[PDB]
Design a protein around this ligand. Structure first.
Ligand SMILES: [Cl-]
Length: 349
RNA sequence: UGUAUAUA
């Protein structure tokens, strides 16, 4: 009749008016794994202002932790006790699940409990959770679920305590490549770039530079490179802008690497933009200047447009004096009218 | 005219 109870309450939730948490004492597991009972627990926890009601079920939560954390409805019940305002309970709760954290990190509901704990609890408990992640970190970083736990770790824990995550990006020669071209691993790389110290990220970026071409034009790798441009050193931007400038047409005409140039133009210094415009207007002795060839391309026309929006009036004037002759012919090409229309603002001198 | 992340 525990089951009949929850049938009663799915029928007449009016009969849940006068019902409090301490009353389901003993039936917590059935309630928390039920859609209606889980909502009752959650709502009661959020509206009760009686600490002793909430404490009365806590021992049942701690005892059934392992069965609630990867349950479709139970995982919410567990997360409610990782709230700000239940801090007396964080340690007991972390202890109920610590030994199975290497499994929970891969599971689609329990990994939400781990992300909540990392969001709310204090640094020693965070580190205690991370200590278990160490055991599975490489598989975890590439997992659809585990990578969110790792990303959350990186946002919420001080840089020094995720050195082992950086050390995992640098495990082997090709690990940074393998992660950058992986749909989940690449988010971990990006989180590291945004939040680790420059001493931590320097060997990461250096690994990225070694296979820069391949990562830049990868559907996930290009966002890794974009993050390097934004969070890397001035010497990284110089190395990157020097490379794209030397190969401006090749990077500009590929689907993924063309976003890399756009990022250089948005983050780059006047000196950086000058290299890119300078490469774009180079009078290649027997062919059209590559800024005109770029405007004929399916991806690179978005790049030329980014130059006009991002460079200095002086530099823009070099673009205009280079592109003005070819405007007849450019209107012919696919979308050439739309491409030049969006540029009309600049050619009405 | 061109790109990405797990719950009722
Ligand atoms: Cl290497």
């Amino acid at each position: 009749t525990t089951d009949d109870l929850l049938t009663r309450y799915r029928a007449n939730p009016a009969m849940m008016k006068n019902l409090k948490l301490s009353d389901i004492r003993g039936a917590l597991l059935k309630f928390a794994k039920d859609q209606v009972g889980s909502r009752f627990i959650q709502q009661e926890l959020a509206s009760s202002k009686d600490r002793f009601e909430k404490d009365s079920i806590f021992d049942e939560v701690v005892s059934n932790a392992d069965e609630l954390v990867d349950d479709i409805f139970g995982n919410y019940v567990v997360q409610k006790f990782f709230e700000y305002g239940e801090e007396r309970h964080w340690a007991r709760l972390v202890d109920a699940i610590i030994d199975r954290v290497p499994e929970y990190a891969f599971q689609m509901y329990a990994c939400r409990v781990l992300q909540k704990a990392l969001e709310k609890i204090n640094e020693p408990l965070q580190i205690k959770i991370l200590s278990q992640i160490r055991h599975v970190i490489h598989r975890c970083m590439k997992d659809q679920n585990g990578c969110r736990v790792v990303q959350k770790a990186i946002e919420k824990v001080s840089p020094q305590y995720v050195q082992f995550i950086v050390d995992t990006l640098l495990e082997s020669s090709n690990t940074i490549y393998e992660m950058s071209v992986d749909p989940y691993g690449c988010r971990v790389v990006q989180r590291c770039l945004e939040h680790c110290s420059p001493s931590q990220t320097k060997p990461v970026i250096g690994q990225i530079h070694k296979r820069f071409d391949e990562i830049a034009n990868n559907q996930y790798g290009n966002y890794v490179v974009q993050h390097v441009i934004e969070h890397g050193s001035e010497e990284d931007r110089m190395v990157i802008v020097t490379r794209v400038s030397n190969n401006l047409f090749e990077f500009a005409t590929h689907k993924y690497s063309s976003n890399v140039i756009e990022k250089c133009l948005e983050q780059g210094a006047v000196y950086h933009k000058s290299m890119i415009v300078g490469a774009a207007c180079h009078h290649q002795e027997g062919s059209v200047p590559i800024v005109v060839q770029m405007m004929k391309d399916q991806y690179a026309n978005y790049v030329v447009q980014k130059m006009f929006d991002q460079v200095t009036s002086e530099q823009r004037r070099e673009l205009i004096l280079t592109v003005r002759p070819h405007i007849p012919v450019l209107r012919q090409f696919p979308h050439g009218k739309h491409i030049l229309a969006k540029l009309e603002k600049y050619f009405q001198k």
